[PDB]
Design a binder for this molecule. Structure first.
Ligand SMILES: O=C(O)Cc1ccc(NC(=O)[C@H](Cc2ccccc2)NC(=O)CCc2cc(Cl)ccc2-n2cnnn2)cc1
Length: 236
């Protein structure tokens, strides 16, 4: 996250750090807890990933440095990628991880609700991107989960910013006209979380964008409400 501030323990308890262990252990992507055995993440995250056997899901982490040889983690039983996924920029950048066991929800690991049936109308004015990514292009993965408030922009404005890409209704765009705050390298797969009526909804998944927090170039996020039937199909 560029222009972001450190978060506190328990603040974004649906957030996960997904690690690879091949050829060495490191943060791969962010993720959101949506069910006791279910993580929602980005499809492009598994580009180099031979099978679910090398993946670890770490819940309840503020700082990446807490993850020791004995920090418990969740195994991944399955990686379900949307069947129309090709590259992130052309959409369908959505995947589910089935954990090998159920999450017991605590103050440090909770589910985030999907956008509600009946709220397709809603204008979300309180949206936040979280993660452990670079604070600029060319940087490193950050130790403390970061947070940053970012405004949604219309799909019409976003298309005018990316005239070389097809910006469709299954994408949602977020960023400041001036730049400054946005997701960056290492934040993909994580949530764009919006509070509506004091309930937090998983409105987008960090996907792609041109540069990190440049002016007139919003972040592009998988539009979660357009995939709720796909998620429910796969998670029932
Ligand atoms: O190895 C390391 O140093 C740590 C390390 C760990 C993860 C990553 N991740 C990435 O490069 C992934 C795309 C990607 C994910 C997984 C596999 C391949 C590509 N991209 C992102 O996370 C941010 C994408 C992104 C999303 C949004 Cl909404 C806006 C801007 C951007 N960026 C534009 N230029 N850079 N970022 C980078 C470095």
């Amino acid at each position: 996250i560029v222009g972001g501030t450190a978060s506190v323990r328990g603040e974004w308890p649906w957030q996960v750090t997904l690690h690879t262990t091949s050829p060495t252990q490191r943060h791969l992507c962010g993720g959101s807890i949506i069910g006791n055995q279910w993580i929602l993440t980005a499809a492009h995250c598994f580009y180099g990933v031979e099978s679910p056997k090398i993946l670890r899901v770490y819940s309840g982490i503020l700082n990446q440095s807490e993850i020791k040889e004995d920090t418990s983690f969740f195994g991944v039983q399955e990686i379900i990628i949307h069947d129309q996924y090709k590259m992130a920029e052309s959409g369908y950048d959505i995947a589910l991880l089935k954990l090998e066991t159920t999450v017991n929800y605590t103050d440090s690991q909770r589910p985030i609700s999907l956008p509600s049936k009946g709220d397709r109308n809603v204008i979300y004015t309180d949206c936040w991107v979280t993660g452990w990514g670079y604070r600029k292009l060319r940087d490193k993965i950050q130790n403390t989960l970061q947070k940053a408030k970012i405004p949604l922009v219309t799909n019409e404005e976003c298309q005018k910013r990316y005239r070389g890409h097809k910006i469709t209704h299954k994408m949602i765009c977020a960023g400041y006209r001036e730049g400054g705050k946005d997701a960056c390298k290492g934040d993909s797969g994580g949530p764009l979380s919006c509070k509506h009526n004091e309930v937090w909804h998983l409105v987008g998944i960090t996907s792609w964008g041109e540069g990190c927090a440049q002016r007139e170039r919003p972040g592009v996020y998988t539009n979660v409400v357009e995939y709720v039937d796909w998620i429910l199909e796969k998670t029932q």
